[PDB]
Amino acid sequence: MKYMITSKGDEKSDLLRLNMIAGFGEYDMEYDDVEPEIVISIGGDGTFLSAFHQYEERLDEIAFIGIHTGHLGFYADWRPAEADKLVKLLAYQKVSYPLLKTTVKYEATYLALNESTVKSSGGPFVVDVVINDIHFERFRGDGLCMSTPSGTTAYNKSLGGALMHPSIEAMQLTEMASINNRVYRTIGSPLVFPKHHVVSLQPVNDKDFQISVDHLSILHRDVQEIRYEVSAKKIHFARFRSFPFWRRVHDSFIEDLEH
Amino acid sequence: MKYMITSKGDEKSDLLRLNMIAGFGEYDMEYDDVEPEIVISIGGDGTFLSAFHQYEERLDEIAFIGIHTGHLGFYADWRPAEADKLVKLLAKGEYQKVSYPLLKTTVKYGIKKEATYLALNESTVKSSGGPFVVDVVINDIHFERFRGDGLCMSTPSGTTAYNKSLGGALMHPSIEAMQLTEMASINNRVYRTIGSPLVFPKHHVVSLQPVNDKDFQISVDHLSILHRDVQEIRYEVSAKKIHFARFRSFPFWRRVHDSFIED
Amino acid sequence: MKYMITSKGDEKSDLLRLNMIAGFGYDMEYDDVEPEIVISIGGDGTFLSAFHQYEERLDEIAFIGIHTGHLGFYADWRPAEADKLVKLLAKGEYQKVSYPLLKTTVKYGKKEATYLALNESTVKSSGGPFVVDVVINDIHFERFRGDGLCMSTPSGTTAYNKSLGGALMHPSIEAMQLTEMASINNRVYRTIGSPLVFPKHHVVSLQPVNDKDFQISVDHLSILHRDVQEIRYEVSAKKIHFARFRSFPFWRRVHDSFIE
Amino acid sequence: YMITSKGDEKSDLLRLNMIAGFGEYDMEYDDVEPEIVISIGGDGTFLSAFHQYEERLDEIAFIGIHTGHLGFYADWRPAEADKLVKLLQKVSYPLLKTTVKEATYLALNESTVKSSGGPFVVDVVINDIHFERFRGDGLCMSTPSGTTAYNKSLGGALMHPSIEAMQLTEMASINNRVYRTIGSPLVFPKHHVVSLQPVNDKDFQISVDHLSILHRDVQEIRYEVSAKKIHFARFRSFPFWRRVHDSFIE
């Protein structure tokens, strides 16, 4: 079938990449980096993110799989030692994760695998948080972070967000160093929104914001509204053994007694 | 239909109750506190909790409704002044029902039998004097070894209660999940915990297993009873749901906004 | 000089105790009534009991702690060093290090009771919601509603205070730290959220709103005080004295406990 | 004496209103050797007045007027400008000395350090002893008076300015098995030095109050409580905690 492999750029990833293509050189597999059905990422989560955005137009036609050449990742969950076992077994069941739809208004749309953040471009960050066409709070601080379920283990976790299992179709809004005084009273707690819930970020003073989607920071000028909602689109993973989400959370933050 | 009303106990709630009973007494409504189809709580959220636990065996045949005689509650969403419009719409049967998820707490001893509990807000587990030390096993796999005050597993609707004060996230009740939060974790080299709140979906089981002490203080919606010789405490989203009678639209986030931001 | 030793209670501590006492058998006399050197064997909780056992002779006592289990913040010396400990103290070749303490004063409806804390002093309700007014230096600061409040010593910041999200303070700083316990921080009961660090001569007064019965704990000594009118917190003028031999930095001790 | 302005018309007019008063009591406007510096505007305006005279802090008593809201440095309302000139005890606050590797900086609020286009990974060395390996957004070392600013938003504690210390807070620490951090804010006394050492990237974005500068080839960033103190001119009694109350509690 049709496949392609991306690389982090270093020698370890390039070497493992070519060796797998050679491995694919022992089965009925065709290399296509234009119309693939299987995209293989080699490196880290950041590499996996780049592979996701490289083919965010064919997510319905692509099953992703990740190998971490460095530390254990949440998307790159396969070890380099299992590269032989991978080409054999793929030549399987599919697992789908939710995505975050980001809409900007001046309309531009973005898909997030991890999260979408909004900060100021040269002053204090002051916006109104509107939930389902109804005003909720006025935020002032560094910024706001709307995270995907799979992305809760990333920037979200560092910002004090909760960890949600990816089978839950939702989004999580977390504060970034919010000034919580008498003028700008915010909820403080992270907020988890279900499907069809729209979180609208509307400017108060400055209308130019620094918006990043999976760390794709672009400075949007003359912004009228930033809308957040659970995308109807989903990323598909190729599953072979059972590597539970909580196990990956455990091995990353608690301990990994066999490595 | 068959209905009943519970009261907070003060004059305002008792007075409103009798007036509503008289109101239903002008339609095809029968007062039945044994097999009701509509349970109306008058007072606060704590009052609503008592009404829920009073009828936890008939949740599938009961639509709850709450009236707050004091401050706005998350379960008590009706003002006393709308009791008249309430009786009219309940007698006509002009309402749709909305369901919230619940938390099943299972305790296991050295088999004496086995006890199960349902929570609307949350279920907490603490020590009976000394330090609280348990192993957190997620779906038959060890996750962490906890040492501290205790742990708190919350329902989606219960996230606005104890969960929020403990640093938990707020989840919309339409989401079928449960949320585990730490209660003063020591989080050191020996007892390393995740720190972050954990949100578990359906069919996920959180098993708490004792390390030294086997006596735990278990609370379900603030009903703390001392269980001795505990072998296992299991948490999972119950298949049972509490049903609410909806008339107008009072959004959860609006209820959160009005409660914590400003009103 | 005169010394005495306390034990955690288990065999490891009791055996290590007798072996050390046997070591002193130097010009050292065992006196548990008027001791000059107090040796704690077990854990920090054991050290706390030894501290409160002789809180009336703190000016004439240099404390030292041995952890038979994991490393503690007061019991910071390992059991393998029990021989070296007895030797160095018998010559009297050691300097003294002092840590600040927390004075807790309760006022009723009767007299007034005072307590000394090495770690912290906490106040919770004795049934139901905990609602008090936090008054700083005779001036109202906030109205708290939740589980309780915790006023911590500098050395005690590494204890309960840290689990509650409090900051860690170096014990050389003469101060106290107030932390919240599950505040319902809403529109009616708006709290500061942040931990508050108070200097000397600053008085934090906790005054009841409705319920007047509170659970007051001093270094985990919980007693039910009835008819409470006021709970006062301030840095005590008294200090706990440690026997220093080598250099075991506070931050190094924090590192070994939480980082490693 | 001398007077600084926020830049807007409100401050300039108010400045002129006070300056006319001083020509009747025996004080001459000197922006080279002032003994009393008057700030008109906000806390941010006060910061500029502080940084304008970091070489004469030992010979200057500061005073702030807020044309807007109650500030933590600007505690006088414009209506009390008249009472000021008549009276015009000293109160000293601790400061944060920041050393880059040699550049030295004084901070009134805080000093933060982040990366210049990637992950922020440094070794936190406390008194020549390794404490932790940090990975995240950055770190924030705050002065006692600055704890009510950026420090508070980062979850730091609020400490009374009479306490001579500094407070380190984390900025989005990943805190995993590899990069285990303390999580808790750390309050350091005098003579304690927190040394931040690079692991891979050596380019960092360092900010002092509000002077964000991109340092390349950084070998070490040292933090310690400065021996210098900022002196305030106090007339009435405005307790720090009431000021905290008025701002965040309401």
Ligand SMILES: [N-]=[N+]=NC[C@H]1O[C@@H](n2c(SCC(=O)NCCc3cccc(Br)c3)nc3c(N)ncnc32)[C@H](O)[C@@H]1O
């Ligand atoms: N009251 N009542 N009803 C019981 C609910 O009260 C909520 N709750 C509990 S009960 C846990 C407990 O033993 N708290 C001791 C002090 C206290 C008791 C009751 C209410 C309050 Br407020 C405080 N504490 C909570 C808290 N600190 N913040 C916000 N919700 C809390 C729990 O989630 C229960 O569901």
Ligand SMILES: [N-]=[N+]=NC[C@H]1O[C@@H](n2c(SCC(=O)NCCc3cccc(Br)c3)nc3c(N)ncnc32)[C@H](O)[C@@H]1O
């Ligand atoms: N045992 N003992 N030592 C008492 C000390 O234990 C420290 N401590 C307390 S005591 C408060 C309490 O009653 N907690 C209930 C469960 C518990 C009891 C005792 C130790 C522990 Br751990 C847990 N909780 C602490 C906590 N969660 N984290 C880190 N230090 C704590 C306090 O600072 C006391 O000074």
Ligand SMILES: [N-]=[N+]=NC[C@H]1O[C@@H](n2c(SCC(=O)NCCc3cccc(Br)c3)nc3c(N)ncnc32)[C@H](O)[C@@H]1O
């Ligand atoms: N690679 N990469 N970057 C993409 C992911 O990095 C995650 N991430 C971001 S990106 C936000 C940012 O600009 N951070 C500046 C410092 C930094 C950048 C990238 C990684 C790290 Br670690 C630190 N910060 C994160 C954080 N502090 N903790 C744990 N994940 C973070 C985001 O969720 C992105 O998904």
Ligand SMILES: [N-]=[N+]=NC[C@H]1O[C@@H](n2c(SCC(=O)NCCc3cccc(Br)c3)nc3c(N)ncnc32)[C@H](O)[C@@H]1O
């Ligand atoms: N000039 N000026 N501003 C600098 C002051 O702003 C205080 N401050 C900063 S600055 C951090 C930052 O880079 N924020 C994004 C752009 C920005 C510039 C100036 C002010 C603000 Br806000 C934001 N954030 C703060 C925060 N989140 N909470 C409370 N105080 C904050 C810092 O403590 C400085 O003292």
